[PDB]
């Protein structure tokens, strides 16, 4: 592909591990971007991780182990942004 967009779900006390919710490529990525902005879902540029999840990740499966370290950084960033935005 040229463009990649991958959805990740992680809610502490609900999901024991993070889940892959979607995988889109190319033409569908601009559409995903619009809907994410409209729905208040954060969209982060992580070129190595998006590329890695493109090859390995399966929709409605847990994030693979090969990407959990890189995913945990994104998740810890998202939690820090959430707590800070409450100020």
């Amino acid at each position: 592909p040229t463009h990649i967009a991958i959805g990740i779900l992680y809610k502490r006390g609900e999901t024991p591990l993070p889940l892959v919710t979607f995988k889109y490529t190319d033409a569908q990525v601009q559409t995903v971007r619009k809907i994410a902005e409209e729905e208040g879902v954060p969209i982060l540029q992580r070129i190595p991780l998006a590329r890695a999840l493109y090859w390995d990740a399966l929709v409605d499966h847990y994030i693979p182990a090969e990407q959990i370290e890189a995913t945990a950084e994104v998740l810890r960033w998202l939690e820090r942004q959430n707590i800070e935005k409450q100020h």
């Binding site: 995903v32 809907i35 982060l44």
Partner: protein, 53 residues
């Protein structure tokens, strides 16, 4: 006059011909695209974050 009658076979043939129509094929594709758009909105709403390249 003798009453016209479409056989079960004629009805199937006329309908298959209709399914071959460019306008009718286009509407099927359009319907599939609308379900994909709906699914895309639901997939995004179910997510915590989106990672992009």
């Amino acid at each position: 006059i003798k009453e016209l009658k479409m056989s079960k076979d004629e009805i199937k043939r006329e309908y298959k011909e209709m399914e071959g129509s460019p306008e009718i094929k286009s509407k099927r594709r359009q319907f599939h695209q609308e379900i994909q758009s709906r699914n895309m909105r639901e997939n995004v709403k179910r997510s915590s974050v989106v990672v992009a390249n």
